[PDB]
Design a protein around this nucleic acid. Structure first.
Ligand SMILES: [Co+2]
Ligand SMILES: [Co+2]
Length: 218
DNA sequence: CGTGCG
DNA sequence: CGTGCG
């Protein structure tokens, strides 16, 4: 991947400035130094899979994500594929309401058992405003059986910690060995992932701020 | 590992 | 409180 592609990835998925994490066999662990270009290349090649601490040190985030998963209890069933489709359904319902609010967002298959819905901002926004917005919008949709949705950021203040992390796309899931790629509104894998990454549109912080004031003051 | 969520 | 999840 070009230097430009790496610079664009590091700009969209920009979280804690001086700590990241990588997936090991027993889970994720913090790497206590800034993310560098070689780390991205190790992610893109499948050698080391990255996870990003969304919460920056001033309790702001530059991106956010819904995490839509099939419950692990349902993976053993012969109708497992019904719950894959149900997870697409939940994703489509979130996507429509997000678009009603003019929150531009993007789909990614996670490499395991669900989808991320990625939301990017032009400059970082206060974590509690976007967590509040995402929870309100999520409460508006109907969940399908066997499907769980989590929101990142999982917290809105660090209180001296790191917060929770999210696996970022264009790598491999270390538990399955499967790539995690962007998909289109039909959930088909996109052929040119880098060019899709360049065309990703960031929402405006001033817009997010207004939308929070409107919903909060109801 | 850090810490949320049942 | 135990311990999955990223
Ligand atoms: Co997930
Ligand atoms: Co999840």
């Amino acid at each position: 991947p070009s230097q430009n592609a790496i610079k664009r990835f590091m700009t969209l998925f920009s979280g804690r400035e001086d700590v990241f994490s990588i997936q090991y066999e027993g889970g994720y662990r913090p790497i206590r130094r800034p993310l560098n270009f070689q780390d991205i290349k190790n992610h893109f090649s499948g050698k080391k899979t990255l996870g990003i601490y969304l919460l920056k040190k001033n309790d702001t985030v530059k991106f956010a994500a819904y995490d839509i998963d099939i419950k692990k209890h349902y993976l053993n069933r012969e109708d497992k594929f019904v719950y894959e489709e149900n997870s697409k359904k939940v994703a489509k319902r979130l996507s429509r309401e997000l678009n009603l609010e003019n929150i531009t967002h993007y789909f990614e298959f996670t490499g395991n058992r669900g989808y991320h819905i990625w939301i990017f901002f032009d400059i970082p926004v206060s974590a509690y405003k976007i967590k509040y917005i995402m929870e309100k919008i999520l409460d508006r949709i109907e969940l399908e059986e066997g499907i769980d949705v989590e929101i990142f950021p999982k917290q809105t203040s660090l209180n001296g910690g790191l917060g929770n992390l999210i696996k970022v796309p264009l790598g491999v899931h270390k538990k399955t060995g499967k790539k995690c790629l962007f998909v289109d509104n039909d959930f088909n894998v996109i052929e040119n992932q880098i060019e899709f990454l360049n065309n990703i549109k960031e929402n405006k912080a001033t817009e997010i701020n207004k939308l929070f004031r409107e919903i909060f003051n109801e």
